[PDB]
Design a protein around this ligand. Structure first.
Ligand SMILES: Nc1ncnc2c1ncn2[C@@H]1O[C@H](COP(=O)(O)OP(=O)(O)NP(=O)(O)O)[C@@H](O)[C@H]1O
Ligand SMILES: [Mg+2]
Ligand SMILES: [Mg+2]
Ligand SMILES: [Mg+2]
Ligand SMILES: [Mg+2]
Length: 398
């Protein structure tokens, strides 16, 4: 990597500040999904093994007033982590103070402490989420000049717990998970093994305009599916019946088509129905046009075939957005057809970067065939737009 990583610094005997992603779902003080804790382990375990003293920071949920702190303590997360590590995780229950400092000083090589929910500092003046200078300086002062960022999911935002600490230590470096997110979502896009085929779907053009623009420059082809299809169709004068469209984005859609120079590949048919729910007729369109009284709810079979051919021999694929209304079994074919066409390509580096897209891959038994499934959400989108994220800018150059 071009930034330093946790492997590039000497950790033995040192306090090591780590931003981890422990923002797990809770219900009544109970963790309902530990995936993010599991995903955090490799970096944590590495620091322990190297003889570092791990001081962990995370947010959980959002905290606007004092009453919001209830339910959002990391106490259950500290317990969960300790069980996964097979050792104690010290948990003073505070975000700052002399007791916290005393607890940190007492850590021996290989031990772990978890600071309370960083967004507890948001109650008085949004200090974490608005990156109060004094808070970042304070949290940095708890360490020995090393900060490891392993939370790609907030890398697109400037908070005290990422950029604040980074600004106040000598070495701010990437953890193992963030390193992989950068490798797949930034470097594999900027410097792709070609052919690079991007696939963008989902409900709407408006949340993907920046990514389409960037990937039109970086990719060899960009395949479009999902509801976003019908905004592109309407911009061309194609009838779309009752399909999901953003009339306020017709001009931008028209402009992306004009600039695409043949790189933007639309569906050539749809599976349509005469209602979104409670439909009594479902059928394939003959071609692009959707029937009056109907709406398009998946790409059609000619489109699946065309996209499969477009994917032949791809070496890099980035995918965000289902090709149809995947929640419904009648409209899963387009998405399944594209997933299978992606993962069969020899040597392909296949990368998923959307929430419903990852869920679909996992649910339908294809996820294990992809190279990387991103969980960075807004960060993933902003990085696919080609933006310089503050949490990454803040990292030390190798
Ligand atoms: N033809 C369609 N008409 C209406 N909705 C559609 C259509 N195709 C897909 N969708 C919806 O698109 C939604 C998912 O879109 P989107 O949220 O953009 O995907 P994602 O994988 O979650 N990407 P992101 O939100 O950036 O992480 C689902 O609710 C689908 O039902
Ligand atoms: Mg490096
Ligand atoms: Mg046609
Ligand atoms: Mg989504
Ligand atoms: Mg330089």
């Amino acid at each position: 990597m071009a930034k330093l990583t946790v492997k590039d610094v000497d950790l033995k005997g040192k306090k090591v500040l780590v931003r981890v992603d422990f923002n797990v779902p809770l219900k009544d003080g109970v963790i309902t999904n530990d995936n993010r804790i599991t995903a955090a382990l490799p970096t944590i375990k590495y620091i322990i093994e190297q003889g570092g003293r791990a001081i962990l920071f995370s947010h959980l949920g959002r905290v606007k007033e004092e009453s919001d702190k209830a339910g959002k303590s990391l106490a259950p997360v500290a317990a969960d982590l300790a069980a996964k590590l097979g050792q104690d995780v010290v948990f003073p229950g505070v975000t700052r103070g002399a007791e916290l400092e005393a607890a940190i000083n007492a850590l021996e090589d290989g031990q772990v402490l978890l600071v309370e929910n960083t967004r507890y500092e948001d109650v008085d003046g949004k200090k974490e989420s608005k990156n109060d200078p004094e808070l970042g300086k304070y949290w940095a002062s708890l360490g020995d000049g090393i900060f490891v960022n392993d939370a790609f999911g907030t890398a697109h935002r400037a908070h005290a717990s990422n950029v604040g600490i980074s600004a106040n230590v000598e070495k701010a470096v990437a953890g193992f998970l963030l390193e992989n997110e950068i490798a797949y979502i930034q470097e594999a896009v900027e410097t792709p093994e070609r052919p690079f085929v991007a696939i963008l779907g989902g409900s709407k053009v408006s949340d993907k305009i920046g990514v389409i623009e960037n990937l039109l420059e970086k990719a060899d082809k960009v395949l479009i599916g999902g509801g976003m299809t019908y905004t592109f169709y309407k911009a061309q004068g194609i009838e779309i019946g009752n399909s999901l469209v953003e009339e306020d984005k017709l001009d931008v859609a028209k402009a992306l088509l004009e600039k695409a120079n043949g790189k933007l590949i639309l569906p050539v048919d749809s599976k349509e129905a005469n209602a979104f729910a409670g439909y009594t007729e479902v059928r394939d369109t003959e071609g692009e046009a959707v029937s009056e009284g109907f709406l398009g709810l998946d790409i059609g079979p000619k489109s699946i075939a065309k996209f499969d051919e477009a994917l032949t021999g791809a070496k890099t694929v980035v995918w965000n957005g289902p090709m149809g209304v995947f929640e419904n079994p009648d409209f899963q074919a387009g998405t399944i057809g594209v997933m299978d066409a992606i993962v069969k390509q020899p040597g392909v580096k296949s990368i998923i970067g959307g929430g419903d897209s990852a869920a679909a891959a996992i649910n339908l038994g294809r996820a294990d065939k992809f190279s990387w499934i991103s969980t960075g959400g807004g960060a993933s989108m902003e990085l696919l737009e080609g933006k310089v994220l503050p949490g990454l800018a803040a990292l030390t150059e190798k």
